[PDB]
């Protein structure tokens, strides 16, 4: 739905790395460097942001 | 369950300091037995394990 | 107008022959296992293993 605040495996704060991740991907970085240049080093954290489907823009369309 | 049809009931929530941390600093997330493999022969789970590790380490998405 | 299947080098319980012909059959549910049927080459003693 929305990005988890902490990474699941080891609790790095990854909730503050989502808008700056989309910003790196719109600026023509690759996902192997938009996860490198945010400071996500272990693959348990890079799992959390690469594989995340932000399912709340589709969910807010049904707005009153 | 995983996606290779190998159900596992949740038995015990083991605290994080007790988990075997790796050489990279990572604890695991789910511990799975080696003893679900020789009778059920899910080679697809081992290749999915290697492939998910090699995809999260590179940003790729693997076919 | 045979050789009773492929052999595996397993010792028989009765006659002690070095090999037993085997046949598999998935007799349980789809949840677990594969039941292996053995048959000795010489004295034809059939036992089953459940893995
Ligand atoms: Zn982590
Ligand atoms: Zn025999």
Curated annotation (Swiss-Prot), chain A:
Gene, per the UniProt record: POLR2L
Assembly with partners or alone: Component of the RNA polymerase I (Pol I), RNA polymerase II (Pol II) and RNA polymerase III (Pol III) complexes consisting of at least 13, 12 and 17 subunits, respectively. Pol I complex consists of a ten-subunit catalytic core composed of POLR1A/RPA1, POLR1B/RPA2, POLR1C/RPAC1, POLR1D/RPAC2, POLR1H/RPA12, POLR2E/RPABC1, POLR2F/RPABC2, POLR2H/RPABC3, POLR2K/RPABC4 and POLR2L/RPABC5; a mobile stalk subunit POLR1F/RPA43 protruding from the core and additional subunits homologous to general transcription factors POLR1E/RPA49 and POLR1G/RPA34.
Function in brief: DNA-dependent RNA polymerase catalyzes the transcription of DNA into RNA using the four ribonucleoside triphosphates as substrates. Common component of RNA polymerases I, II and III which synthesize ribosomal RNA precursors, mRNA precursors and many functional non-coding RNAs, and a small RNAs, such as 5S rRNA and tRNAs, respectively.
Superkingdom of the organism of origin: Eukaryota
UniProt GO BP: regulation of transcription by RNA polymerase I; transcription by RNA polymerase I; transcription by RNA polymerase II; tRNA transcription by RNA polymerase III
GO cellular component, one term: RNA polymerase II, core complex
Keywords: DNA-directed RNA polymerase, Metal-binding, Nucleus, Transcription, Zinc
The protein's name in its UniProt record: DNA-directed RNA polymerases I, II, and III subunit RPABC5
GO molecular function, one term: DNA binding
Gene3D superfamilies: Homeodomain-like
Binding-site residues, Zn(2+): 7, 10, 44-45
The UniProt record lists the keyword tRNA-binding: no
Cellular localization per UniProt: Nucleus; Nucleus, Nucleolus
Entry similarity comment: Belongs to the archaeal Rpo10/eukaryotic RPB10 RNA polymerase subunit family.
Family annotation (SUPFAM superfamilies): RNA polymerase subunit RPB10
Swiss-Prot record, chain B:
Subcellular location: Nucleus, Nucleolus; Chromosome
Signal peptide: none
Residue positions binding RNA: 7
Top-rank lineage group of the source organism: Eukaryota
Family: Belongs to the RNA polymerase beta chain family.
Domain note: The active site comprises the fork loops, the loops and the rudder that stabilize the transcription bubble and assist polymerase translocation.
Function: Catalytic core component of RNA polymerase I (Pol I), a DNA-dependent RNA polymerase which synthesizes ribosomal RNA precursors using the four ribonucleoside triphosphates as substrates. Transcribes 47S pre-rRNAs from multicopy rRNA gene clusters, giving rise to 5.8S, 18S and 28S ribosomal RNAs. Pol I-mediated transcription cycle proceeds through transcription initiation, transcription elongation and transcription termination stages.
Subunit structure: Component of the RNA polymerase I (Pol I) complex consisting of 13 subunits: a ten-subunit catalytic core composed of POLR1A/RPA1, POLR1B/RPA2, POLR1C/RPAC1, POLR1D/RPAC2, POLR1H/RPA12, POLR2E/RPABC1, POLR2F/RPABC2, POLR2H/RPABC3, POLR2K/RPABC4 and POLR2L/RPABC5; a mobile stalk subunit POLR1F/RPA43 protruding from the core and additional subunits homologous to general transcription factors POLR1E/RPA49 and POLR1G/RPA34. Part of Pol I pre-initiation complex (PIC), in which Pol I core assembles with RRN3 and promoter-bound UTBF and SL1/TIF-IB complex.
UniProt name for this protein: DNA-directed RNA polymerase I subunit RPA2
UniProtKB/Swiss-Prot annotation, chain C:
Binding site for Zn(2+) 2: 12, 15, 40, 43
Disulfide links within the chain: none
Protein name according to UniProt: DNA-directed RNA polymerase I subunit RPA12
The organism's place on the tree of life at top rank: Eukaryota
Domain commentary: The TFIIS-type zinc-binding beta-ribbon domain contains an acidic hairpin motif (residues Asp-31, Glu-32) that likely coordinates the nucleophilic water and magnesium to cleave the scissile phosphodiester bond and release the mis-incorporated 5'-ribonucleotides.
Portion of the full-length sequence here: 64 to 126 of 126
Function: Core component of RNA polymerase I (Pol I), a DNA-dependent RNA polymerase which synthesizes ribosomal RNA precursors using the four ribonucleoside triphosphates as substrates. Can mediate Pol I proofreading of the nascent RNA transcript. Anchors into the Pol I active site to monitor transcription fidelity and cleave mis-incorporated 5'-ribonucleotides.
Zinc finger (TFIIS-type): 8-48
Subunit-level organization: Component of the RNA polymerase I (Pol I) complex consisting of 13 subunits: a ten-subunit catalytic core composed of POLR1A/RPA1, POLR1B/RPA2, POLR1C/RPAC1, POLR1D/RPAC2, POLR1H/RPA12, POLR2E/RPABC1, POLR2F/RPABC2, POLR2H/RPABC3, POLR2K/RPABC4 and POLR2L/RPABC5; a mobile stalk subunit POLR1F/RPA43 protruding from the core and additional subunits homologous to general transcription factors POLR1E/RPA49 and POLR1G/RPA34. Part of Pol I pre-initiation complex (PIC), in which Pol I core assembles with RRN3 and promoter-bound UTBF and SL1/TIF-IB complex.
Family that this chain belongs to: Belongs to the archaeal RpoM/eukaryotic RPA12/RPB9/RPC11 RNA polymerase family.
Short sequence motif named Hairpin, residue ranges: 31-32
Organism: Homo sapiens
Gene: POLR1H
Location relative to the cell: Nucleus, Nucleolus
């Amino acid at each position: 739905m929305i990005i988890p605040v902490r990474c699941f495996t080891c609790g790095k704060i990854v909730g503050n790395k989502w808008e700056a991740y989309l910003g790196l991907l719109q600026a023509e970085y690759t996902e192997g460097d938009a996860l490198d240049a945010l400071g996500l080093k272990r693959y348990c954290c890079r799992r959390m942001l690469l594989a995340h489907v932000d399912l709340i823009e589709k969910l807010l369309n049904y707005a009153p | 369950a995983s996606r290779h049809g190998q159900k596992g009931i949740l038995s015990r929530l083991w605290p994080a300091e007790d988990m075997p941390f790796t050489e990279s600093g990572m604890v695991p997330d789910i511990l799975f037995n080696p003893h679900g493999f020789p009778s059920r022969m899910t080679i697809g789970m081992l290749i999915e394990s290697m492939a998910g590790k090699s995809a999260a380490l590179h940003g790729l998405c693997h076919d | 107008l045979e050789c009773q299947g492929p052999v595996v080098d397993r010792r028989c319980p009765r006659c002690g022959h070095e090999g037993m012909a085997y046949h598999t059959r998935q007799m349980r549910s789809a949840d677990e296992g594969q039941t292996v049927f053995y048959t000795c080459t010489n004295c034809k003693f059939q036992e089953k293993e459940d893995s």
